[PDB]
Amino acid sequence: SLAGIGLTTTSTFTTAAAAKTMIGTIDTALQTATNKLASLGTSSVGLDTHLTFVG
């Protein structure tokens, strides 16, 4: 969620200079979001493997 990735809701850029830092903020947000989703995918594969073994 917006708090989770550090975006901070109701956070915009009022001038043409805050956008120069918003670029980097969105880059970091995208990086950490993709990392979290990769971890979730790994966990799902683990669940599948253990289910097979339990069978």
Binding site: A19, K20, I23, G24, D27
Partner: protein, 54 residues
Amino acid sequence: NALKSDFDSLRDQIEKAATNAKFNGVSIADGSTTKLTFLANSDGSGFTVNAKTI
């Protein structure tokens, strides 16, 4: 007097021709601003074009 009036007309013409050269409200020939910065990199770094008032 005729040559002076010709001179004055041509000067007024230069002024009109100079102040009308705006695209989208922004221009680099009137002298309104000191420089224009465009995007040049996917991270925000800019391409700088100084202003050349004419």
